[PDB]
């Protein structure tokens, strides 16, 4: 709803990030290993403070509760593309925030950074995630065979995308 | 009214700057992307401490509430010019402070720093500010086409300026 | 099963780690010289923060009491093997938690890290431990002669291993 | 024919790399901007020397003429995948070396480095290369729309891949 | 003509740059001071090796003679704009290379970096330079009063621009 | 015997070392990924200059032609063990020099460095090498299962060792 | 006389210094641009800690209230000259303390630092100050034309000096 | 006029500079202690490469023979003033080149750097030089008493200046 | 009695070390100059943290009172020897702890660290300590003449030592 | 008396040192300038932590009151000489501590550092200081003409010395 | 003879040092391992340039031939003692240089550094080395049991010493 | 005679300095230990380049042969004093250059550097130099007992000095 906002990741938010990053159910959706020392996380945060190739956001509601995370990575400024990734804390999954956040990230991407294309990756074995994204405007541009090793097996992922033209003329 | 005071920005004012630097509406007037972790801001602040090409001032009232920011950037040592930009916190806007601060900035630029020229950029779609600036003696020297991408599209901005000779000598 | 969790080692867990490292009987299991300084431990921790060739984990119960430690070292990314080490604090041994921790270290190695082989070393003079590793599917691949100097004399150790294919099938 | 040899790139090969990195035609196949001072190249080379996420190989003939470059990047330690990219110097192109080198890269990736998957990107408007790659066992897993801005417009690329199990076991 | 090319500035070209930078007739066109130690020039070259906000080019003919310089500065990757500046060595002024180079720089800008806008600055007192640029597609978007101090006086400069759409649909 | 000498590795010997490291058949003996950059090799050399946990030696003949290489790594100063590796350039194999180099590496380990145990790894698929090590007094202490990924598949290696007491008596 | 003392500037006195530096009327006396950041002031303080070419002193009364500041800069050790600057906080002007501070700065320059010449600059538009310096023995040696840009226009300043021989006799 | 040019000082011109700095009679004009090390000169050159508060120029003739040196120091960007210094090597004095170099330094200060005031110091005991500066439009603004210790005694110097407005009209 | 415990020295024990390092009487037994600012001690401590040629242990009782220090230095990786030195805080001296700690140090040196030889130096004018050490199995291997300048004059010291084989096997 | 001791200077003692160093009556006896920022003093203390060429001591009584300072500087280890300097805080001047401290410093010098010679400097205009030192064993080895500028004038100082042999055979 | 001299070790002499250090017959006399990369040797030389605790000398004859090495280590400046070690290149062993060099090192030690005691270590199994040193004034102060592991065995060494008083009153 | 010239020491003069710094006889006149690797000398040279407390001069003849060295050290900014020391290479000694150079050093110290006092130390057992210095106007202000250990024993040195007022004004 109206009460959801995206603001930049700050040092004070790292305990919430850490807590998610050490949760394997949550990190499987980012095809990332669920082990990260707090120090690894903080030192990488420090290292990338001035990195222009990424934007990391925390999501809050009106009381300032941390709902989840939005990220734009691999921002390329010739091709004007970037990869979008999102995580909703367990407690907040299934409340309808998903679409709002995807929209907010697309708005950031398209009305602020002036990117041309946003793409994401989703487990083919999560076909309800796939559909969601389709309803939010994304379209399948690839079916990556055995791209990621997750939970003892290689899994297929859809690569999906959306263009600036489509998002702004809606 | 007259109770406003200028002083240089310092580390302890940065939570206030940060707050404005993450406000979409406020930053659109500066054509700046509204995202800055506190760490990026502080690190850049630290790096520019001895940088002569800029001056960053904070505006406080008698009881020390932080009202706004006045800055001069791209200060050039030869051409004696600089770009002026101003921000008034939203809770303190529409209180007639603009003029007062624009004049403090002009007075500083021309009676202390000895610059010859000050210019600014203002969105064309912001005619109230254009007007305000004109009344404060600035004059349009350019209409930059599709200069900045703001809130989903390319926009035009006025470049306006004022000379030290004009400002100092007007009433003479 | 459920209550015991595994998370990455943190700077705040270092006094727990140091305390085990001063028990010489506990360090004899890792063939590591006991009695190391807290500062050495901390500075070595700082240095390996981004070292991808190791994973150090702590074992916490439901109330967040530190039970012990599980580590994977010498992780090799071509051969996809690593050495496994485990320590259960003395006040939590005999509670039957070794098995669950071993299974947890194997789950991590094989379902997340995607390694092919996990091996470990055990003193031959610790046949109870050897036996526990045998039940968890480890097989002896070496009987290393006078490999380590422990408590005044050279001792033999067993090298034992398990493959990913065996753990996942 | 069979007289080609692979070895790791080293500092003394950089004038050759530089030459290719400033060639517009050659770099368009890598979707890379064709501008790199020697200094940027050397500095980045130096920085990545111990970087495990990449392997850069040079191809030499019996008399040591530098023919091309074979690289693997984004090597991931868990997923065991990497992106393959190749370049053959223009004076040595159209001499049937492609296949030979693509096979050396596959043989390295799968019989030495123990990767599970290799992928590449090829412009859709480059059907000869797509075909060549297919014949070398790669298979289309995606048609990326308007992925790269090349020579004035946004273009589609095929993402193609090959698995270690398929490659190792085909003839069995 | 066909024989003119743009390649990246290299360390070996710095003696040619220096020689131009210490020539006041040449630097007045860039509103820059004609004093630069070779060491200042080289140390600034070293410092900006990895700067993404600029591209500096040397211009040569077929025998590899240094004809002049092309530069794109203040590249901004949200607004996708940049400032273009050019210098033709004295010996090569008046041979018709000017238009080719402006075209080459626009081609780099528009077919490679994917920028939206290119702008430049010209002395109002050089109205034949102004016209040239007008014929090459640039249009006046400003008349900057007393913007630069040059040869003992403050001088007016036109700010001129061209958009990607116009350059590519020609 | 006499003609072959052993001296420490030097920066000027690095092109010889690099050249062996590009022969994949030669590097398969060290289970080391071949094709490494000269700069990586040099910078790793620079970094380990004062590392007391390794000794890298070159083997020179009477005319100062580089024959091969002998190294001692993972030298442990409590357990007093180390791993031995040896490479004889291809143009000097079949000349019967392996034996002399092994004996020379053992002499160094046991009469100068005062180590207690020397071990090595050998591919099981290289029974000639195993046999040579057996004649020089090494005994198998482990048959490591699928330890290394070589030429497209996991292979077994032998771990073999000799003690100081046996070499000196 | 007695109550007023002079001691070296300290990091804890910096907020006092900063506060004077924001009064533009106070900084006009030093021809220094007012409104400088506390961090710039502190970092410049840190940088000059061991700079032998300056001495910055604070003036304290009997109750340790900061009265003002006295500085000696561009101290030259061959020519043995230095430039003198003094600032008396506004809440302590008109108390007749300038004289005592000048005499104190001269005593320091000539009886401790062993300098030969002390000079200063004063705005011509500040004839009261010029007059005070004249009574303390300073003589005009220069009338510098349009030397500084102050409050919107170029102004003339006096350069004035006193020698060691004159102060000590 | 034409033949004499001015360009920025370069590292390759340093032996020329050093050579003047060892003539004590030449350095007396700059009130600079002569006999400074080449290494000090070079390292100070390295340190000031990006210092915007100075410009050091060399004077070359048609055949690229170094004639002398012209410098602008203490350039202040608010007050827009700077101090001018000039040295003509002894083998090129009496050739009437001082005038052209002064005019060239003023042209640079006022038509490029956009300064408002240029000043210099001259020993009173050098009335020929004072006179030359007077012809080039400089006016005495100060007679500094015993400002410098030169050749065994304190000497007076003249401070002289010219404004931009006067030079440009 | 048996309630003593050894652990490695750590930063927080340094005020105690400092106290002993500035005690003239205590330091004369170590032939060391009794002057060390806390800063010199901490800086050197920090520098030797990863230094393998030494081990520094603190001795604590059941309630954690710091009793003394046991150290081994000049640990040589080849010769497998080290110099042993011990200090018992004065308030805890003459309580029969010496033997107990000397034995803990021997047990560590020979059953954990696998050294072959431990030696120490003792002032000749300190016959009680010589004797104590002899009873603990050390044997005189040298009488160093005028080796150290102590309390105004040059003095002789006994160098005494013990072998691992002797220590481990005595009772066999 | 018995209750006076010498211990090494520590960081915590620097406020007492500073207070003396900014007292001109006290620093004149060391021919030193009475101006030292606390930061200068502390940074020089940090720099010389490992300097073997000096030993700086604080003097206390039984309640741990800071009485003054002892210093051995320019320790040379071939020539085995050093310069001794002492300061007694104003409050403690004239109580008879002087001789005890000189003795303690000589004892340190001669029974611990094993030096051969200790020398000092005293204002000729303080002839009662000269005599004291003579009674403590020092002897004049020089009368340095106008060696130091102090209080507006050049002053003569005696250089006095004592040898280890004499101190230990007493 | 007269033609033997001691001068400080220099970088240019390191190839001669290296050559000796990688000769096990030569390094056994210093109880040192015969393996040293040239780089290890040079980097340690660089590190110890300013170390006051040692003096390393090269020995030459009149034509400037490198004869061997003299070293004074563990120089302690309170106790005024140091360890002396010497090596004569193989080619020059048995020519009578030994005594001259020991004398030269003692002269350096006693007439220049002003040390009180010099000690050395010798293999008990080299009793002709022991006697030599006895004739040069050294005397046994210890018989160190199994002090060093050399050539596959632990060996006993004599510790021998000489005092300044004895060397200078000869 | 008069053909001598002073200039500051520079890096390229260091082989000459090194040669003198390793000469026992030459260094005994400076009470300095005659051992200095080239590296120690260069490193210290480099470190003192901007050190104001010293001046090191080389003496050259018309054809640029390096004759000797004149130095001033411990230059104090307040007391305006310095220690003078001189060395003449042995091949050029006993040629009457001493006086000439001592006078150049005095002329520099007093007419350029504006010092008030110069002093030196000379071995008592070196009466020829004492005398020479006296004739050059220096006067004994101290007889330091057993100040330096030289060639096996402790020796006395004269401290001699000269004032700027005396030197400048003598002939007046």
Map out the domains of chain D as residue ranges: 1-172
Query: From CA F29, how far away is CA C83, in angstroms rounded?
Result: 22
Q: Do I43 and J55 touch (CB under 8 A)?
A: no
Assess D149–E contact: CB distance below 8 Å, yes or no: yes
Fold (CATH) for E1-170? Aminopeptidase (3.40.630)
Q: Calculate how close chain I gets to F114, using CA atoms only, in Å.
A: 6
| Residue in F with minimal Cα distance to K22 | F7
C-alpha gyration radius of chain K? 16
Q: Do L149 and J31 touch (CB under 8 A)?
A: no
Cβ distance E31 to E121 under 8 Å? Answer: yes
Assess H114–B contact: CB distance below 8 Å, yes or no: yes
Assess D151–E contact: CB distance below 8 Å, yes or no: yes
As given in the structure block, the two tokens for residue C123 are 């003193």
Q: How far is CA E121 from the centre of its chain?
A: 9
Query: From CA H105, how far away is CA J129, in angstroms rounded?
Result: 62
Least Cα distance to H77 among G149, G39, B169 occurs for G149
Active site annotation includes H29 = no
Residue with tokens 């000092």: J120
Q: What are phi and psi of G168, to 5 degrees?
A: -75, -20
Residue with tokens 């517009």: D24
Q: Do D142 and A146 touch (CB under 8 A)?
A: no
Least Cα distance to A108 among A3, A1, A2, A8 occurs for A8
D41 membership: H or E segment, kind and range = helix D38-47
State the angle between helix axes of A127-135 and A97-107 in degrees (0 to 180), rounded to the nearest 10. Answer: 50
Coil, strand or helix: which one is C116? Answer: coil
Compute how many other C-beta atoms are within 10 angstroms of the C-beta atom of residue E68: 23
Compute how many other C-beta atoms are within 10 angstroms of the C-beta atom of residue A15: 12
The sign of the torsion formed by the CA atoms of E95, E98, E100, E105 equals: positive
Touch of B by G (3+ CB pairs closer than 8 Å): yes
C-alpha gyration radius of chain H? 16
Which CATH number is G1-169 given?
A: 3.40.630.30
E62 membership: H or E segment, kind and range = none
Q: Which residues neighbour D119 within 8 Å (Cβ) at sequence distance 6 or greater?
A: D81, D82, D83, D84, D141, D159, D160, D161, D162
- Terminal-residue alpha carbon distance, chain K: 19
Q: Which residues neighbour D39 within 8 Å (Cβ) at sequence distance 6 or greater?
A: E10, E11, E46, E49
Query: From CA H17, how far away is CA H29, in angstroms rounded?
Result: 14
Cβ distance H163 to G146 under 8 Å? Answer: yes
CA distances from I3 to D61, I6, I59 (A): 75, 10, 10
Assess K48–L contact: CB distance below 8 Å, yes or no: no
Q: Do I151 and J46 touch (CB under 8 A)?
A: no
Q: What are phi and psi of L36, to 5 degrees?
A: -160, 115
Query: From CA K102, how far away is CA L21, in angstroms rounded?
Result: 23
Q: What are phi and psi of L103, to 5 degrees?
A: -70, -35
Residues of D in contact with F28 (CB under 8 A): none
Query: From CA G51, how far away is CA G72, in angstroms rounded?
Result: 12
Q: What are phi and psi of G6, to 5 degrees?
A: -135, 130
Assess H36–L contact: CB distance below 8 Å, yes or no: yes
**D34-38 long-range contacts, Cβ below 8 Å, gap at least 24?**
D34/E112, D35/E8, D35/E55, D36/E8, D37/E8, D37/E9, D37/E10, D37/E11, D37/E49, D38/D14, D38/E10, D38/E11
Q: Do D49 and F38 touch (CB under 8 A)?
A: no
Query: From CA K2, how far away is CA K100, in angstroms rounded?
Result: 9
Across the E:H interface, residue pairs with CB atoms under 8 Å apart total 34
Least Cα distance to A158 among A117, A135, A129, A118 occurs for A129
Fold (CATH) for L1-172? Aminopeptidase (3.40.630)
- Which residue positions of A form the known binding site for acetyl-CoA? 86-88, 93-99, 126-135
Assess K132–I contact: CB distance below 8 Å, yes or no: no
Query: From CA G83, how far away is CA I47, in angstroms rounded?
Result: 46
Query: From CA J20, how far away is CA J14, in angstroms rounded?
Result: 10
Residue with tokens 């003192």: L48
Closest Cβ–Cβ partner in H33, H39, H149 for L10: H39
Assess F110–K contact: CB distance below 8 Å, yes or no: yes
Least Cα distance to J14 among J62, J49, J50 occurs for J49
Query: From CA F9, how far away is CA F5, in angstroms rounded?
Result: 12
- Strand partners for K69: K58, K87
Q: What are phi and psi of L105, to 5 degrees?
A: -70, -40
Q: What are phi and psi of F114, to 5 degrees?
A: 60, 40
* H helix runs in chain A, sequence order: 14-21, 24-28, 38-47, 97-107, 127-135, 164-168
State the angle between helix axes of J38-47 and J14-21 in degrees (0 to 180), rounded to the nearest 10. Answer: 120
Q: Where are the beta strands (DSSP E) in E35-134?
A: 55-60, 66-76, 81-88, 117-123
Compute how many other C-beta atoms are within 10 angstroms of the C-beta atom of residue F135: 9
Query: From CA H96, how far away is CA F134, in angstroms rounded?
Result: 95
Compute how many other C-beta atoms are within 10 angstroms of the C-beta atom of residue G35: 18
Query: From CA G158, how far away is CA C98, in angstroms rounded?
Result: 88
Q: Which residues neighbour E73 within 8 Å (Cβ) at sequence distance 6 or greater?
A: E53, E54, E82, E83, E85
Q: How far is CA G155 from the centre of its chain?
A: 19
- Terminal-residue alpha carbon distance, chain F: 20
Rounded to a whole number, what is the largest CA-CA distance in chain F? 44
As given in the structure block, the two tokens for residue D28 are 């368009």
Touch of E by D (3+ CB pairs closer than 8 Å): yes
Give the residue from D114, D115, D170 with the most F CB atoms within 10 Å of its CB, the best one to mutate: D114
Query: From CA J113, how far away is CA J135, in angstroms rounded?
Result: 23
Please indicate if the annotation marks G125 as binding a ligand: no
- Strand partners for K162: K118
What was the structure determination method? X-ray
The sign of the torsion formed by the CA atoms of D6, D7, D12, D16 equals: positive
Pair type for strands H81-88 and H117-123: parallel
Coil, strand or helix: which one is D140? Answer: strand
Residue G11 DSSP code: G
Least Cα distance to H127 among H80, H169, H160, H103 occurs for H160
Q: Where are the beta strands (DSSP E) in chain C?
A: 5-8, 55-60, 66-76, 81-88, 117-123, 139-150, 153-163
Residues of C in contact with I7 (CB under 8 A): 22, 35
Residues of D in contact with E80 (CB under 8 A): none
As given in the structure block, the two tokens for residue G6 are 């002079």
Assess F138–C contact: CB distance below 8 Å, yes or no: no
- Strand partners for L155: L148
Least Cα distance to G164 among G121, G122, G107, G120 occurs for G107
As given in the structure block, the two tokens for residue E144 are 């900057």
Query: From CA F162, how far away is CA L67, in angstroms rounded?
Result: 67
Query: From CA A112, how far away is CA E79, in angstroms rounded?
Result: 10
- Which residue positions of A form the known binding site for spermine? 27, 32, 40, 48-51, 83-85
| Residue B137 CB burial class (10 angstroms; 0-12, 13-18, ≥19) | middle
Assess L4–H contact: CB distance below 8 Å, yes or no: no
As given in the structure block, the two tokens for residue I5 are 């415990």
K50 membership: H or E segment, kind and range = none
Q: Calculate how close chain B gets to H78, using CA atoms only, in Å.
A: 6
The sign of the torsion formed by the CA atoms of J97, J100, J105, J108 equals: negative
Cβ distance G112 to J33 under 8 Å? Answer: yes
C130 membership: H or E segment, kind and range = helix C127-135
State the angle between helix axes of H98-111 and H127-135 in degrees (0 to 180), rounded to the nearest 10. Answer: 50
Q: Which residues neighbour L51 within 8 Å (Cβ) at sequence distance 6 or greater?
A: none
- Which residue positions of B form the known binding site for spermine? 27, 32, 40, 48-51, 83-85
Residues of L in contact with G112 (CB under 8 A): 78
Cβ distance F72 to F54 under 8 Å? Answer: yes
Measured in angstroms, the resolution is 2.3
Half-sphere exposure of residue H59, counting CA atoms within 13 Å on the CB side?
25
Q: How far is CA J21 from the centre of its chain?
A: 13
């Amino acid at each position: 709803n109206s009460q959801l906002t995206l603001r930049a990741l700050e040092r004070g938010d790292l305990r919430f990030i850490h807590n998610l990053n050490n949760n394997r159910n949550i990190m499987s959706y980012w095809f990332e290993e669920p082990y990260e020392s707090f120090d690894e996380l903080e030192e990488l945060y420090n290292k990338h403070i001035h990195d222009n190739a990424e934007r990391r956001f925390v999501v809050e509601d009106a009381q300032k509760n941390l709902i989840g995370l939005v990220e734009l990575i691999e921002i390329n400024y010739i091709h004007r593309s970037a990869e979008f990734q999102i995580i909703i804390a367990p407690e907040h999954q299934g409340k309808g925030f998903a679409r709002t956040l995807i929209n907010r990230a697309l708005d950031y991407s398209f009305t602020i950074l002036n990117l041309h294309k946003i793409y994401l990756h989703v487990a083919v074995e999560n076909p309800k995630a796939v559909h969601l994204y389709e309803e939010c405007g994304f379209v399948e541009e690839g079916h990556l065979v055995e791209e990621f090793f997750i939970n003892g097996r290689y899994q297929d992922v859809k690569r999906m995308y959306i263009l600036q033209s489509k998002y702004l003329n809606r």
